[PDB]
Amino acid sequence: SFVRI
Amino acid sequence: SFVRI
Amino acid sequence: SFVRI
Amino acid sequence: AIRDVMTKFAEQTTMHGVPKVINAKSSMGRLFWSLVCLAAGAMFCLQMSEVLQRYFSYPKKVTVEVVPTPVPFPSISICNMRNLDVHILNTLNRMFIEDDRPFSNINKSEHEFIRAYMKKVAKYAPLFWNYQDEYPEVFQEIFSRTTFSANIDPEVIALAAVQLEGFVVNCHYAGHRCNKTRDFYRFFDPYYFNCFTYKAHEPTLSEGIENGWSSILLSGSGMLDKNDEIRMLPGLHEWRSAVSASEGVRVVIHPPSTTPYPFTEGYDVPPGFSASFGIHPRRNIRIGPPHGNCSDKNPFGDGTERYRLMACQKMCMQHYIVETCGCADVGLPKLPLQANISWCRDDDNFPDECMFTASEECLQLLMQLHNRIKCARSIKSKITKNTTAMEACNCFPPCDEVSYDVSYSLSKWPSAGYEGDAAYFDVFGIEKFNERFNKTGTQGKYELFTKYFNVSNREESMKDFARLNVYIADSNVVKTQESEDYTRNQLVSDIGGQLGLWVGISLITLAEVLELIIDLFRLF
Amino acid sequence: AIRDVMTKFAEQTTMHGVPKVINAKSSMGRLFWSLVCLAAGAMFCLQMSEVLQRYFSYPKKVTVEVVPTPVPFPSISICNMRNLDVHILNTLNRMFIEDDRPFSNINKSEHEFIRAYMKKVAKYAPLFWNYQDEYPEVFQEIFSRTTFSANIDPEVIALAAVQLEGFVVNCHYAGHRCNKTRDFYRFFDPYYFNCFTYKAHEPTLSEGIENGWSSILLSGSGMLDKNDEIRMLPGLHEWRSAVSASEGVRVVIHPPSTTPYPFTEGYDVPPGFSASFGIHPRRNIRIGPPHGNCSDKNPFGDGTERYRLMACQKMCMQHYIVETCGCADVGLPKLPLQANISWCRDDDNFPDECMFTASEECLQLLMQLHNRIKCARSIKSKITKNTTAMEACNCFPPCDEVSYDVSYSLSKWPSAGYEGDAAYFDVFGIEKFNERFNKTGTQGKYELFTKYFNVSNREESMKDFARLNVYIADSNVVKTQESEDYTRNQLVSDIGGQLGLWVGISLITLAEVLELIIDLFRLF
Amino acid sequence: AIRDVMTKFAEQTTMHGVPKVINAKSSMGRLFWSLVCLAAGAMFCLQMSEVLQRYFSYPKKVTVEVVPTPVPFPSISICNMRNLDVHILNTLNRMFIEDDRPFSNINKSEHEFIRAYMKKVAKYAPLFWNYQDEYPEVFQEIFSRTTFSANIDPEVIALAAVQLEGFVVNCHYAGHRCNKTRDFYRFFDPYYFNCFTYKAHEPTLSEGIENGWSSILLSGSGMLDKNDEIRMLPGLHEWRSAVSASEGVRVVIHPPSTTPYPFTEGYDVPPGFSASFGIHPRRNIRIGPPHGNCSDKNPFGDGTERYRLMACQKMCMQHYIVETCGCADVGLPKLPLQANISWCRDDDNFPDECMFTASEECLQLLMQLHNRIKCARSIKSKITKNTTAMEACNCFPPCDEVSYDVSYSLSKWPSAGYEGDAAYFDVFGIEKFNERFNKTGTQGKYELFTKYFNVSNREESMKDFARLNVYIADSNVVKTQESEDYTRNQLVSDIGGQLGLWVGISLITLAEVLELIIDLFRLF
Ligand SMILES: *[C@@H]1O[C@H](CO)[C@@H](O[C@@H]2O[C@H](CO)[C@@H](O)[C@H](O)[C@H]2NC(C)=O)[C@H](O)[C@H]1NC(C)=O
Ligand SMILES: *[C@@H]1O[C@H](CO)[C@@H](O[C@@H]2O[C@H](CO)[C@@H](O)[C@H](O)[C@H]2NC(C)=O)[C@H](O)[C@H]1NC(C)=O
Ligand SMILES: *[C@@H]1O[C@H](CO)[C@@H](O[C@@H]2O[C@H](CO)[C@@H](O)[C@H](O)[C@H]2NC(C)=O)[C@H](O)[C@H]1NC(C)=O
Ligand SMILES: *[C@@H]1O[C@H](CO)[C@@H](O[C@@H]2O[C@H](CO)[C@@H](O)[C@H](O)[C@H]2NC(C)=O)[C@H](O)[C@H]1NC(C)=O
Ligand SMILES: *[C@@H]1O[C@H](CO)[C@@H](O[C@@H]2O[C@H](CO)[C@@H](O)[C@H](O)[C@H]2NC(C)=O)[C@H](O)[C@H]1NC(C)=O
Ligand SMILES: *[C@@H]1O[C@H](CO)[C@@H](O[C@@H]2O[C@H](CO)[C@@H](O)[C@H](O)[C@H]2NC(C)=O)[C@H](O)[C@H]1NC(C)=O
Ligand SMILES: *[C@@H]1O[C@H](CO)[C@@H](O)[C@H](O)[C@H]1NC(C)=O
Ligand SMILES: *[C@@H]1O[C@H](CO)[C@@H](O)[C@H](O)[C@H]1NC(C)=O
Ligand SMILES: *[C@@H]1O[C@H](CO)[C@@H](O)[C@H](O)[C@H]1NC(C)=O
Ligand SMILES: *[C@@H]1O[C@H](CO)[C@@H](O)[C@H](O)[C@H]1NC(C)=O
Ligand SMILES: *[C@@H]1O[C@H](CO)[C@@H](O)[C@H](O)[C@H]1NC(C)=O
Ligand SMILES: *[C@@H]1O[C@H](CO)[C@@H](O)[C@H](O)[C@H]1NC(C)=O
Ligand SMILES: *[C@@H]1O[C@H](CO)[C@@H](O)[C@H](O)[C@H]1NC(C)=O
Ligand SMILES: *[C@@H]1O[C@H](CO)[C@@H](O)[C@H](O)[C@H]1NC(C)=O
Ligand SMILES: *[C@@H]1O[C@H](CO)[C@@H](O)[C@H](O)[C@H]1NC(C)=O
């Protein structure tokens, strides 16, 4: 995997 | 910083 | 050094 | 009688053939002379057919030569490949690290650009938290640079984009230090947010290059925080464009009174290098409609800028995009006819509920925006290869054009050792570059530059700077001038030569035949 | 009587001079008029001599202009400066580290290229163990790239050279993703083992550059093992060539249907940089034998490829090398006449006993091979400066040629910080570059790329990539067209003008003198 | 009577008009024919006015074509951007570290350049110890490179500048190793202290590039000591010039028998890179005074060098500087008329007391020198834009000129891994580069290079080397030739055509009117 801001 | 040679 | 393969 | 006037015409004629035919006393002689006259006339007609075919083809004549007449120094437009300021980028990264929800960060900063940015990102975050695995490509495109430039007021972006005071460390032109406030002019570009055009100012601080223009630019991004994990920062990366993530300076050399188009023209300079731009000026002069095609003004634009074919072609592309997809492409100039057309990346119709829930309506609106972008991109790629459409825009090369051929070379600017120490002292000891950001409104940037650009790590930190050296390599201008190859005077001379060679007639000899036919009409 | 016909001719003549001479009633008047006629005739003859000298020199007329007619997008040939695959190189290095005798390593690998390579190296190793100090230069030349390409089946080398799937990370053209299997065509070059030519495919994955061609290439060699000691790896280094050990991509921009000659044309791109190639297309049109020299086809080759002067010149050089040294140079195309000629670096005559003992016969054969290479090199250097030999090959420039002028610039592609993180995610997160080598036949490469291209060391590992940005800078084509300056029609016009000015004759006036001489012959 | 001779002239005239007028038997017919003749004459005069306007404008005719005639290989001038030798620089730095007073260090070294350097620096040190805060810019300018080159004997500087044996690691041309003593010629430049020009030597060591010139150069400065504090080293940094602190090689490609002007022409190559220079030769032929402006020789110089417009322009600039400021600019050639003019940076008038006390007289002399430098710089910047002054020097382009267009590209020369190991072995194992400095007079340099260029740190140390690859890209020469467009023969033909078309006269017809006016003068 989860790419987070 | 005083610059010396 | 003597260069070897 | 007919024979009387025939004999008269035969005796006072200046024509060379019919005197033989009229006074002929033998049938075979009459036949021979008539055949001679007819053959001469036919060959004369063939040669004149060739002559007139050459003339009405309106050929052109071109000469290439070097002339001493000097051209004005070209305008130089420099665009940092990093759109936003380093301090703003670090602030955004740290804010997202502390809290990854953009909605909660809207009121955490007093900077207007940050507030607008976080509002815009929050209008997409819930979708980005649910649909990465299913539509990774869509979110990459939506979070590109052009989306923010098309939806945020440019006067708000200008407060966070690269500033002139923090971009141009030093400048020199014609042996004098440049005035940064009077010589540089800021312009907005949708991809390179802030760009600056240098306009030459001749001498009325006597230092620097005498035969050209030189400047030191801060272009690297080594002072940005190095995250331990991959994190998305919207507005930074133009997904899969040809200039998607490059580092350095984009430099465009163009005539002084023209608008630069950085994404399709110019040169690149990497940080840590010194670039030499040897300009060889050229001038082209062209002929008008009958012999060629040239124009003095842009059909789509006003008269405040000098004409270049690129402007006309780009405006034609924008015109064809607007008619097809119903929206204007942000990567092309907005036609000065109507400015009610919305950018294809406009998204102000997104509801506020998309900040809170990942509803299917928000996803459908995202898909609609993606489809609009795809329409614009598809029209961009194909319209230039369609000759029928392009010819309808009447884009013709300028009648009087100045062009520049540039020799491009690279050096490693900050030399290792003592000369690099001298360069560092020049930048930070004499010019006092850090002291320009010790002002209240930029206190955070001051600490970052003081820590980064310290004496201990000067060999690595100075690699973020770049130098441009723009100079005129040849004083003489290579002039290409068009002219009409076959003037009416030359046509008259050729017609006279052909007429004299084959039949011997003159135009006052035609007055003799006019007199003869007057006499015949009177006698009849 | 003669006077009767003379008086008649004088009264019905259209010639301007001899009427005065014939009817002259004074001797001094006759002398004056005869002198006038003779002087006019002599000056007329001189002027016609000048006119005919101008005409039979067959001068050419050239015009340079910009036209809107578009040229097709050029073919792009990319050649990795590293010939072999990284995994194969590491395998060879580790095999030699474990055991430095190539003979014992022949059966240690199932890869065909490795077996052939070790056999070829074993046919030289005993000499290399005894004669480094005495002939260091010879062994450097023998172990060059061209020796292996001239002695190993190219279909065997292709299994170990750089593969397309492991070379082109991504591609984009005309706003669409490229199809790597349909658009790229592999070709073999003796120095750059595997090369790929991109052929444009217009749109019928809407992403990427709209006005050109862009691609990301893996070109660095940072993943190779770093030996603690200097070790010889044959087949890697072309000893003391101008491109002996460079790192990057060789890029050749050429007309779409032509064969690229990478070693004498193209441009270089270093790893870790983004290169912009601004193409300014040009077109040249030339005139045939009487006014110039041009050809539509290659005298030495077939008709399957478009004609370029470089192909003819290289084939002429190969022809002169074959006749002199008795062998073909591997660095030049093989003439399509006879293919029974062996390469000058062919060494299949080496006995198997050279694998076991350093006999003087093996040394003599090595010296013979070195002398053959020296012969080829000597003929290469001098033949181009010998105008007599070069002119005999009848290599003339093409009658209709398309050329490209390229603006070259460099950026630092993977930017430090967040944009570099975005680029890394694009390469490895979305495209999943490593997953293309997780296949069985490439399991070893997978582990190497997984360890090397990890998130922690992305700033250093991504420097092995390079990006090319190829686009057309100017839509208008600069056309240079030759034409005949002095046509036969212009010659006729000039002759008529001269004839009218000096003597006043017309061609039917010559019929009058023909009648006069007929009358004289009848009277005589 | 008048009517008798008029009737005679009317009956034996070859003019077409006045026979009608003279024999006219009606007043209206006489009026009509006279009007016809007058109108024909007037139109003829207008057309001849146009013809003569075209002729006496002396137009030029230009043709652009490719020819197989080969040009000689260009001379290559290479100038290391570091002026002094690395060992000398380290010695100076360590001497100043041990004792910062240059006066006490005058007798500490037997090297002549060091003694002269320390004397020159001591003549300024007391001022530099007192006036940094008040005039930092002045001392930066005084301690520049050009001050030392203008005040120290060039034969003394040559002992400490970059030496050929320590600069060119290897060279190859036309498939043969270059002879460094016979092919390279040393020349002195005020900024780049030592420069070397390569002059081609065709083959009568068969190795290297066959179609061009290649060399490996030591250009980096990574072996210099890394000071913990910023220290001033005079003679290293040219303050705020466009090439102030760059690192690499300056390369100038010019015709074989011409003097290179490195500061305004050439290309840059950074260390650690391999540069490819694809030359496209060109030839220009120009016409003399009546149709153009060209010269075969330099008005200001002797005849020992081939003429280039740059030499004339630079000598004109020097001439205008000498007349205005009373001194010659060291950055321009010294006119070969008078050599009694002192450089604007000459400072031999400084008293010896300035070594001991910072008196106001020494400060005034320093200000005078600064003002002289400012005068020279001011005249340099403005004189080129003053067309009146530049035109007075009669600098015209050469009548027969050879020019080169260069394709510029960069690779990373020492590849990471095995190929870099091969390159390192070639440089240090076979060529034995370090062994060239194991001589007594260079023992200190030997230890520095042995420590720096060791096997362990080869990946970083080899980045100080650079490679140049200069080759001819196209064998055919693009020839631009001027010629007269409108010859006197063409003028005669056009005049004849116009005369025949409008009035029908020939030049022997003018003999008839001359006879008529003779008869009238006799009768009167
Ligand atoms: C750089 O340019 C600015 C703007 O032209 C200069 O500021 C002006 O200076 C003049 C006289 O020097 C004043 O009369 C104006 O009122 C100033 N402000 C304007 C025109 O807005 C400035 O002096 C120049 N040089 C610097 C910055 O040192
Ligand atoms: C000047 O421009 C006109 C208009 O673009 C050109 O005429 C066109 O030529 C193309 C190609 O031959 C045709 O497809 C078009 O139909 C023509 N247009 C019209 C309205 O007939 C003309 O050839 C150009 N001439 C020059 C000298 O540049
Ligand atoms: C890329 O090109 C290949 C080769 O043309 C495509 O494979 C063909 O696809 C068509 C229909 O799309 C089939 O009818 C053929 O049988 C396929 N194989 C051939 C022609 O050898 C492929 O679809 C293209 N796109 C990719 C790889 O996604
Ligand atoms: C066209 O090619 C022919 C043949 O190469 C040229 O004639 C040669 O010219 C050279 C130089 O003047 C002579 O050394 C040769 O002897 C000539 N060949 C022959 C067979 O006579 C000719 O000059 C060329 N013409 C043009 C216009 O290109
Ligand atoms: C490189 O050039 C030098 C200078 O020309 C050569 O030295 C000369 O060699 C010739 C015969 O080879 C002798 O007759 C001269 O006396 C030598 N010295 C001169 C001309 O000053 C040298 O041999 C060449 N090759 C090298 C250095 O190996
Ligand atoms: C050749 O050079 C002469 C002298 O430089 C040129 O004549 C000058 O032209 C300029 C611009 O028209 C005038 O300002 C000067 O006054 C002229 N000089 C004189 C002495 O009259 C001439 O035009 C040049 N011609 C060509 C074909 O190059
Ligand atoms: C070219 O553009 C015109 C615009 O009116 C369009 O109608 C036409 O279909 C286009 N042609 C092609 C081949 O796309
Ligand atoms: C920054 O500005 C403050 C005043 O606002 C000043 O006291 C301080 O010395 C400045 N920073 C420097 C010169 O290090
Ligand atoms: C200088 O800055 C670097 C980071 O750029 C830092 O690691 C180093 O400790 C600093 N040196 C000093 C003396 O503060
Ligand atoms: C040029 O080539 C021809 C090939 O037949 C050869 O005979 C001649 O000797 C060569 N000339 C020179 C000067 O090498
Ligand atoms: C490599 O392929 C295997 C199947 O052969 C798969 O199980 C594995 O997950 C792949 N590697 C990855 C995705 O890390
Ligand atoms: C990443 O790879 C580098 C070598 O390229 C290695 O030194 C480092 O330990 C790796 N990091 C992790 C977390 O495995
Ligand atoms: C041009 O140079 C001349 C040299 O005599 C000088 O007299 C004149 O003032 C200069 N013109 C300008 C505008 O500087
Ligand atoms: C340097 O020269 C000396 C002789 O002066 C020699 O003994 C020594 O071996 C040389 N250095 C080497 C080859 O390491
Ligand atoms: C090689 O030289 C480097 C400095 O360039 C030094 O740090 C290193 O210790 C040296 N290695 C050996 C084995 O001497």
Author numbering:
A (entry chain D), B (entry chain E), C (entry chain F): 608 to 612
D (entry chain A), E (entry chain C), F (entry chain B): 2 to 205, 211 to 530
Tell me what the authors wrote about this structure, in their words.
Here we dissected the structural basis for neuropeptide-gated activity of a neuropeptide-gated DEG/ENaC, FMRFamide-gated sodium channel 1 (FaNaC1) from the annelid worm Malacoceros fuliginosus, using cryo-electron microscopy. We solved high-resolution structures of FaNaC1 alone, with full agonist FMRFa, with partial agonist ASSFVRIa, and with both FMRFa and pore-blocker diminazene, identifying the ligand-binding site and elucidating the conformational changes induced by ligand binding. Each subunit comprises a minimal N terminus and a nonresolved 63-amino acid C terminus facing the intracellular side, two transmembrane segments (TM1 and TM2), and a large extracellular domain. The FaNaC1 structures presented here capture a ligand-free resting state, two ligand-bound desensitized states and a ligand-bound dilated channel state.
We examined the structural basis of this partial agonism by solving the cryo-EM structure of FaNaC1 in the presence of ASSFVRIa, a product of the FVRIamide precursor in several annelids that gates FaNaC1 with relatively low potency and efficacy. This density was best fit by the C-terminal FVRIa segment of the peptide, and the N-terminal ASS segment was not resolved. In addition to the high similarity between FaNaC1/FMRFa and FaNaC1/ASSFVRIa structures, neither preparation yielded additional distinct 3D classes or any indication of conformational heterogeneity in the image processing. Thus, the partial agonism of ASSFVRIa does not appear to derive from the induction of a different conformational state compared to FMRFa. In both ligand-bound structures, however, the channel pore appears closed, with radii of ~1 Å at the level of G503 and G506 in TM2a (G3′ and G6′ in a TM2 numbering scheme).
